[PDB]
A paper describes a structure:
AlkB homologue 5 (ALKBH5) is a ferrous iron and 2-oxoglutarate dependent oxygenase that demethylates RNA N6-methyladenosine (m6A), a post-transcriptional RNA modification with an emerging set of regulatory roles. We report three crystal structures of ALKBH5 in complex with an m6A-ssRNA 8-mer substrate and supporting biochemical analyses. Strikingly, the single-stranded RNA substrate binds to the active site of ALKBH5 in a 5′-3′ orientation that is opposite to single-stranded or double-stranded DNA substrates observed for other AlkB subfamily members, including single-stranded DNA bound to FTO. The results support a mechanism involving formation of an m6A hemiaminal intermediate, followed by efficient ALKBH5 catalyzed demethylation, enabled by a proton shuttle network involving Lys132 and Tyr139.
Using higher ligand concentrations in the sample mixture and the crystallization drops, we subsequently determined structures of (i) ALKBH574–292 in complex with the same m6A-containing 8-mer ssRNA and the 2OG cosubstrate in the P32 crystal form to 2.1 Å resolution, and (ii) a structure of ALKBH574–292 in complex with NOG and the m6A-containing 8-mer ssRNA in the P21 crystal form to 2.5 Å resolution. The three structures from both crystal forms manifest similar overall protein conformations among molecules in the asymmetric unit of each structure, and when compared among the three structures using Chain A from each structure as representatives (RMSDs Cα 0.2 Å (Chain A from the ALKBH574–292–NOG–RNA complex) and 0.2 Å (Chain A from the ALKBH574–292-RNA complex) relative to Chain A from the ALKBH574–292–2OG–RNA complex). At the ALKBH5 active site in the structures reported here, a catalytically inert Mn ion (substituting for catalytically active Fe(II)) is coordinated by the highly conserved metal binding triad His204, Asp206, and His266, a water molecule, and either 2OG, NOG, or a sulfate ion. The C-5 carboxylate group of 2OG is positioned to form a salt bridge with the side chain of Arg277. The 2OG ketone oxygen and one of the 2OG C-1 carboxylate oxygens chelate to the metal in a bidentate manner and form a hydrogen bond and electrostatic interactions with the side chains of Asn193 and Arg283, respectively. The crystallographically observed 2OG and NOG binding modes in ALKBH5 when complexed with Mn and an m6A substrate are of the ‘off-line’ mode. In the ALKBH574–292-2OG-substrate complex, the N6-methyl group of m6A is positioned ∼4.0 Å away from the Mn, a substrate-metal distance consistent with a (near) catalytically productive orientation as observed in other structures of 2OG oxygenase enzyme-substrate complexes. The phenolic hydroxyl of Tyr139 is positioned to form a hydrogen bond with N6 of m6A, and with Lys132.
Residue numbers in the entry: 74 to 292
RNA sequence: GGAC
């Protein structure tokens, strides 16, 4: 039914906020700090679980990190876990001053909301498989700031492998460098979101800021 | 080049 597809896409749009908030100079300053994050990881200055490496995507966990995918035995809903307290490195002060301060000042999230800053560094062709950020781990909303290039955030995609094949998205949301994305409601809880390899044509980094639940399970 |  045209009525059915229009309703779900309407539901997904309802949970999406997106606006330009960082200028080119401000991205350049933050992107430089992101490059230093990569350098410190390759110098071994970070705790073991702070750095999660994959062929075309690295995750740098600060404040709070999580286990996902192949790191889970008997993967299923509710099987994700936080690392033990103090395991991952602290949120860097430049993340507090440059990124979170602007979000708090521009009323994107309340002050003291963020306790987890995760940086996803995508190499050209990189992706992340369709998923819902664990409801048992993270409070809503989910805030992310994009850097180094423009891309798209797709919703409701189905992944096939060998080779990687992605079905037609329910919604493709262009995310540009310096743009802030806020997910809530249906867009965050009742539909998966992903980024496709065809959307990453250059190196792209995104800083994801969240609040972990009080009852969030740890390892 | 793999979070459902
Ligand atoms: O590249 C993005 O913005 C998506 C990353 C994501 O969904 C996550 O790491 O939870
Ligand atoms: Mn996610």
């Amino acid at each position: 039914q045209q009525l059915q597809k229009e309703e779900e896409a309407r539901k997904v749009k309802s949970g999406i906020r997106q606006m330009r908030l960082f200028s080119q100079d401000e991205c350049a300053k933050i992107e430089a700090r992101i490059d230093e994050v990569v350098s410190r990881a390759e110098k071994g200055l970070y705790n073991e679980h702070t750095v999660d490496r994959a062929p075309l995507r690295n995750k740098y966990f600060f404040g709070e990190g999580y286990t996902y995918g192949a790191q889970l035995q008997k993967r299923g809903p509710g099987q994700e876990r936080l690392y033990p307290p103090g395991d991952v490195d602290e949120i860097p002060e430049w993340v507090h001053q440059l990124v979170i301060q602007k979000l708090v000042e521009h009323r994107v999230i309340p002050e003291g909301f963020v306790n987890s800053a995760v940086i996803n560094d995508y190499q050209p062709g990189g992706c992340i498989v369709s998923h819902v950020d664990p409801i048992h781990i993270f409070e809503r909303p989910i805030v992310s700031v994009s850097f180094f290039s423009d891309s798209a955030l797709c919703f409701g995609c189905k992944f096939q492998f060998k080779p990687i094949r992605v079905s037609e998205p329910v919604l493709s949301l262009p995310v540009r460098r310096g743009s802030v994305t806020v997910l809530s409601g249906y867009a965050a809880d009742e539909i998966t979101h992903c980024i496709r390899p065809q959307d990453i044509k250059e190196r792209r980094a995104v800083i994801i800021l969240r609040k972990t639940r009080l009852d969030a399970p740890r390892l």
